[PDB]
Structure 1
Amino acid sequence: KETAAAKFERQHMDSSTSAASSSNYCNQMMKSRNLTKDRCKPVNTFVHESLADVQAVCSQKNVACKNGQTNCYQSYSTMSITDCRETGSSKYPNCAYKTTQANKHIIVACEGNPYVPVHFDASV
């Protein structure tokens, strides 16, 4: 079984590199993280930070999630992230992505005991 927290890790965590190594990073990662299995996930963000530092955001700044839910939290510090979004070339099973490096505050939705991130919401 993959808990929501385990899923958050697979879909969004990548402590292995300090930033996207190439313009081809997203194509490689979207595939290895199984995000192109039954369709091409349209957009996905990877966080290049320790899991401990990301988990700590659940006890930082409480803000509203994009859908109006209230269980979202914003990081005080900026974090190294990579934005992956489909290009016009993308057509399942040939999913294609644009890789974009950024340094922004992250917003995650938290849930549970322990209270940890379970959904990546936005970046500001």
Structure 2
Amino acid sequence: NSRYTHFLTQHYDAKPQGRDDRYCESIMRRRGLTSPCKDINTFIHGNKRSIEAICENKNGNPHRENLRISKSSFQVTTCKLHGGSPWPPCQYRATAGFRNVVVACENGLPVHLDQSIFR
């Protein structure tokens, strides 16, 4: 389940505060996503329990070809790269949101976040 571990590192932040530009610039560095700069990346907030449940029908439905869409809404934060360079320093524009999320599941655990819905 290293893929679920990587999911949480890439797409989960339990308790953030700001969710402003500087939030994104800091957490993208912290989570190892700045070499090269990841062009768009979204963090889900709240409890892990609710995210995992997307993999059951408790809180998910099948979606498109190989994915799952959550029933509940989540507080999210999307960091979008700007400036023109794909290499550090990575400056990010933050967009906070609240909506359901699409993920791919393996062995009942999320292992991919679909970024298209946040683009």
Q: Which category of TM-score, normalised to the shorter sequence, fits these structures?
A: 0.7 to 0.9
- Tell me the percent identity: 32
Q: What CA distance in whole angstroms lies between the structure 2 residues aligned with 1:54 and 1:18?
A: 20
Question: Which aligned segments of 4 or more residues in structure 1 are displaced greater than 6 angstroms?
Answer: none
**TM-score (normalised: structure 1):** 0.83
Of 46, 50, 53 in structure 1, the residue corresponding to residue 47 of structure 2 is 50
CA shift in 2, pair 1:18/1:80, >3 Å:
farther
Q: Which residue of 2 aligns with 1:3?
A: 2
TM-score, normalisation: structure 2: 0.86
CA distance in 1, matches of 2:74, 2:86: 31
Gaps of 5+ in 1: 65-69
| Structure 2 counterpart of 1:67 | none
> What pairs with 1:24-103 in structure 2 (closer than 5 Å)?
24-36=22-34, 38-59=35-56, 60-64=60-64, 70-88=65-83, 90-103=85-98
Deviations, residues 65-93 of structure 1 (Å, cap 9, x unaligned): xxxxx231111111100011101254412
Where in structure 2 are there 5+ consecutive unaligned residues? none
2-structure distance, mates of 1:111, 1:118: 7
The root-mean-square deviation of aligned C-alpha atoms, in Å, is 1.8
> How many positions carry a matched residue from both structures?
114
